[PDB]
Amino acid sequence: YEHATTMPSQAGISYNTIVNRAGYAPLPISITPTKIKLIPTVNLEYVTCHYKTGMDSPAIKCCGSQECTPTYRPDEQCKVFTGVYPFMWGGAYCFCDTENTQVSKAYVMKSDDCLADHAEAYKAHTASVQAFLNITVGEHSIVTTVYVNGETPVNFNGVKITAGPLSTAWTPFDRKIVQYAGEIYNYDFPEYGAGQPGAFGDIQSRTVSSSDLYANTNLVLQRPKAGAIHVPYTQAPSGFEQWKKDKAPSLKFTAPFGCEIYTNPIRAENCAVGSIPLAFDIPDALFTRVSETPTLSAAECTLNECVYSSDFGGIATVKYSASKSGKCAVHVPSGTATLKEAAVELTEQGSATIHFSTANIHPEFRLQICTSYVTCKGDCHPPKDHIVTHPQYHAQTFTAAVSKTAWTWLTSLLGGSAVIIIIGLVLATIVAMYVLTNQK
Amino acid sequence: YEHATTMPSQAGISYNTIVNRAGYAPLPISITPTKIKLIPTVNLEYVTCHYKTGMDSPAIKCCGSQECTPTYRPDEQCKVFTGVYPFMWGGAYCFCDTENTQVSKAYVMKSDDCLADHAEAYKAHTASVQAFLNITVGEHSIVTTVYVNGETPVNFNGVKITAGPLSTAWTPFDRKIVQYAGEIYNYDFPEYGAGQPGAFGDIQSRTVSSSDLYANTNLVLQRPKAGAIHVPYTQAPSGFEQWKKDKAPSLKFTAPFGCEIYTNPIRAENCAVGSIPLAFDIPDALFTRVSETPTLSAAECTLNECVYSSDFGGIATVKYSASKSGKCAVHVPSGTATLKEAAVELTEQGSATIHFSTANIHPEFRLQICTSYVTCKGDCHPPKDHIVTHPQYHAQTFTAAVSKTAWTWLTSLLGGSAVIIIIGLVLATIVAMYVLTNQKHN
Amino acid sequence: FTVTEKGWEFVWGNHPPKRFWAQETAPGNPHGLPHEVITHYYHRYPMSTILGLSICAAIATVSVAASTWLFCRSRVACLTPYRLTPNARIPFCLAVLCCAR
């Protein structure tokens, strides 16, 4: 039996509905989403970190000449300086005045702290929403991870439930993502081999232990001081440190729809966007006959209290006369008012108390208790807190808070004008007929 | 110098071009694609294999009554049978005639050969194209795996090449894929927990070593034969074996555009579809000046051989004169002829012998040699083979084989009718003016 | 089997795949005797040939018909002012040109 329904994508707030089979007992359904994940397909392109300019020891030949032997190290420079007179702690090194020769060699290598301090540059596409539900279908209750593509069913007690795909393909992530220290950034990093010095990705290693890094750090060798053995060099400073200095805040602070960016894998949680359609395939054995359930006669609904707050602020008292004592479903068909509980246990002659929640100043909603339909009618009052710390448990109907006095003002100002213009048109027609009568 | 061009997506065939900076020497560029992969984003759901109905030994109590204690094994059926008089080899087992009890218990576990003989059910989407180019820009050659997204450049000798995305989002792989034994099938397998008895996926193990398998194999326990200790069952046969008996052929034999499906990365090869665009960010240092290259004077082109076959079945011959002895590029700017080599090494008074390929019956193209333009004109003839074992090395232009005789028949029988209608219109106009002149008389 | 210019491939048992490619060697001669060029371009380009011959026959028929129409209307417009005179002395030059009595 196919029963299609649609649940708003928002964690924590319970969703209640019933299946009204035409000659069998009403079947309750209660679905409370706990955690709605959103996982993009994520592809590592490189890593980056601080660098470390490696230097070679100076090769000095006393009254000779030297040549450049390339080691093919990353961003490797090798300039050879003539006319040197170097020094050690034990006096002069060479003994000539000119024609000594010193070779400087510098190169870039990734840092020693690369393993525990580095940024991972990913690419994101094609999210895959997944949800921790908690499903109760006719006092059969499970807690099961669902995959909310339009297939991959969840099976319990012969019921086959399939959570349809999201009505929106929104993702908080861009096409390009940087992860640094538990925090994720929509950042347009340069491609591998396209790194510029002094910016992000001047060091590009393909994996963390790749043993092949791309270095574009603007390393230039300088000429050493007279009487000193050292390798002087000039280069643009580290762009991973400058990127840490810039760092517009993480995606857990700037993402819309209330999303919560986590990374054991990269995911967003509890975004309040879209809505999950549901598909119920209920078998024909769960439908109990009507005569094995309680059924009421002479039931009546009165509103005790009524506040059009955001939580459950309305108490209605239903006085009944039951044929049998047992629990049965309560439900409201419209989104006029949302009840708190999905079932009410009955005595045979008692009076039941239900908790509901409405935005209506003047609510007139038709309850559905076990198989009958009573009409709850009353007036709500404004709450006292301006700002609450829990979201909205009901729906915002258009023209829900019109407050009957303003219905009277709108109906007067909109109907008296129409009355006056139709009596003017009738008077014009009667005057025309009276002219045609008098011209005889 | 930003230079953009376009390359057809076809392996093996060399693609040649040049770059003409307006006052410098022409810089030849050659790209020969070798192996062009297509690797989808592949997502394992479950594996399956043959099942193996395991059976516990029958619990027998004499003048008693057993009970059913479940174990929550996959598809674990259990039933208690009363009125049983079993036999062993050494005589009867009970002394009681009735009120004896035998319990049958069966369950489904996966087979012992599940490791080396299983089929992987995947999901694929949003593939990734990746080629093994062999680029030569100004006699400086590299062999590099380029990625053909719109970025991720290959860098060599200061030259930046970005081979942009394919013109087509076609993939041979469907949304669902089964891999079995090195071959890949487009099969619509059921989801996890939706496996049906008798067909593919009646066993659904999440991974190979998951130790929690879904099984729906229609197992039903049956009553044992009177006087025997066995566990009789009746179930639908192996859906994996029934899938293997049917097995519409692999994607290796059925794929459009002639793809070559492989296994260990799931990938397709050499699918001749689409075209790769290219971006060349060339530094200004490579542009050699004019007078550091040879430059012809009084050149002339003749055609020796001309067959419009599939490969290089034309030979043009250029007699030239130039006051240096070096190599220079040759190129045909139209797609009329596809040349074989990209450069010709020159003497000062010799001749050049180039090899081109064409679809035309009356080829008239303008050959570009070192910095000049000669006109190579001739007549090609049909080739001798109907069917060759190599693809085409040229581009079929519309109106390529129109055969000047048929140009004459289309010029006469269509342009001559226009001559008939205009002389009829002129005759009608002269007649109307002469009638008006005759009626000017009154 | 029919092999086109786009390719063809078969596998015979445990043999490797053999790819084949058709090239443009059509029966006929494209250089003369105009019933030979039509068979050549019919075996060569089958769909385009019938459309080309249809539109060339249609334009030739419309052109010959409209030219005959205009010439007969101009002959009528010439000879009518000399056939309403009751003596009908059509001059000699228009008798030779417009093919009169």
Domain that holds residue A310: 296-377
Which amino acid type is present at position B298? A
Which residue does chain B place closest to C53, by CA atoms? Answer: B410
Distance CA A378, CA B194 (A): 50
Q: Is A158 at the interface with chain B, CB within 8 A?
A: no
User: Edge to edge, what strands does the sheet with B300-306 contain?
Assistant: B300-306, B314-319, B351-358, B337-339
The pair phi, psi for residue A407, each rounded to 5°, is -60, -40
Q: Does C contact A via 3+ CB–CB distances below 8 Å?
A: no
Report the run of H or E that residue A352 belongs to, with start and end. Answer: strand A351-356
DSSP B195-219: PPTTSTTSEEESSTT-S-EEE----
Distance CA B331, CA B27 (A): 11
Cβ contacts of B414 on chain C, cutoff 8 Å? 56, 59-60
Q: Which CATH number do you get for residue A358? A: 2.60.40.350
Q: How far is CA A427 from CA A324, A424, A433, B219, in A?
A: 65, 5, 10, 87
Distance CA B297, CA B308 (A): 30
The pair phi, psi for residue A23, each rounded to 5°, is -135, 10
Distance CA A65, CA B399 (A): 70
DSSP B137-202: ESS-EEEEEEE-SS---EEETTEEEEE---S----S--SEEEEETTEEE---PPPTT-PPTTSTTS
Q: Which two tokens stand for residue A337?
A: 């008012």
Neighbours of C (≥3 Cβ pairs closer than 8 A)? B
B309 secondary structure, DSSP code = -
Could you tell me where the beta strands, DSSP code E, fall in A111-163? 119-137, 141-147, 154-156, 159-163
Q: Does B contact C via 3+ CB–CB distances below 8 Å?
A: yes
Distance CA A301, CA A317 (A): 6
Distance CA A20, CA A370 (A): 11
**Residue C69 DSSP SS3:** helix
Q: Which two tokens stand for residue A144?
A: 């099961």
The structure's method of determination equals: cryo-EM
Cβ contacts of C20 on chain B, cutoff 8 Å? 387-389
Distance CA B131, CA B271 (A): 12
DSSP A276-304: EEEEEE--TTS--BGGGS--BSS-EEEEE
Report the run of H or E that residue A95 belongs to, with start and end. Answer: none
Nearest CB among C26, C37, C71 relative to B405 is that of: C37
B224 secondary structure, DSSP code = P
Q: Is B126 at the interface with chain A, CB within 8 A?
A: yes
Q: How far is CA B109 from CA B106, B210, B211, in A?
A: 10, 12, 10
Q: Is C30 at the interface with chain B, CB within 8 A?
A: yes
Residue B333 burial (CB count, 10 A): 13
**Residue B433 DSSP SS3:** helix
Contact between chains at C67 and B390 (C-beta distance less than 8 A): no
Pairing relationship of beta strands A27-31 and A119-137 according to DSSP bridges: antiparallel
Q: Which residues contact B243 (CB under 8 A, 6 or more apart)?
A: B119, B187, B199, B200
Separation of first and last alpha carbons in chain B: 81
**Residue A395 DSSP SS3:** coil
Pairing relationship of beta strands B51-55 and B275-281 according to DSSP bridges: unpaired
Instruction: Find, among B342, B172, B338, the residue nearest to B270 by Cα.
Output: B172
Which residue does chain C place closest to B423, by CA atoms? Answer: C67
Cβ contacts of B152 on chain A, cutoff 8 Å? 191-193
Q: Are C29 and C46 in contact (CB under 8 A)?
A: no
A57 secondary structure, DSSP code = P
Q: Which residues contact A370 (CB under 8 A, 6 or more apart)?
A: A26, A293, A294, A295, A296, A328, A329, A346
Q: How far is CA A257 from CA A171, A217, A234, A396, in A?
A: 10, 40, 47, 18
Radius of gyration of chain A from its Cα atoms, rounded to whole angstroms = 39
User: Edge to edge, what strands does the sheet with B159-163 contain?
Assistant: B2-8, B275-281, B159-163, B154-156
User: Edge to edge, what strands does the sheet with B387-388 contain?
Assistant: B387-388, C18-22, C8-10
Cα B389 versus chain centre, distance: 19
Best residue of B431, B433, B437, B438 to probe chain C, by most C CBs closer than 10 Å: B431
* CA triple A98-A104-A109, angle to 5 deg: 175
B100 secondary structure, DSSP code = -
Which residue does chain B place closest to C45, by CA atoms? Answer: B401
DSSP B22-88: TTS--EEEEE---EEEEEEEEEEEEEE--EEEEEPPPEEETTS---------TT-EEEEEES---EE
Cβ contacts of C42 on chain B, cutoff 8 Å? none
Q: Which residues contact A188 (CB under 8 A, 6 or more apart)?
A: A174, A176
Contact between chains at B405 and C31 (C-beta distance less than 8 A): yes
A301-335 b/e with 16+ CB inside 10 Å = b? bebeebbbbbbbbbebebebebeeeeebbbbbeee
Q: Are A30 and A16 in contact (CB under 8 A)?
A: yes
Distance CA A179, CA A187 (A): 10
Distance CA C80, CA C64 (A): 24
Radius of gyration of chain B from its Cα atoms, rounded to whole angstroms = 39
Q: Is B292 at the interface with chain A, CB within 8 A?
A: no
Distance CA A194, CA A215 (A): 10
Q: Which residues contact B176 (CB under 8 A, 6 or more apart)?
A: B121, B122, B123, B124, B186, B187, B188, B189
Instruction: Find, among A183, A78, A190, the residue nearest to A123 by Cα.
Output: A190
Q: Is A150 at the interface with chain B, CB within 8 A?
A: no
The pair phi, psi for residue A423, each rounded to 5°, is -75, -25
Instruction: Find, among B99, B59, B53, the residue nearest to B238 by Cα.
Output: B53
Distance CA A225, CA A213 (A): 32
Report the run of H or E that residue C60 belongs to, with start and end. Answer: helix C46-79
Indicate the length of chain C as a whole number: 101
How many Å lie between the alpha carbon of B304 and the closest alpha carbon of chain A? 48
Q: Which two tokens stand for residue B375?
A: 């006109």
Pairing relationship of beta strands B141-147 and B183-185 according to DSSP bridges: unpaired
Q: Which two tokens stand for residue A255?
A: 């993402």
**Residue C67 DSSP SS3:** helix
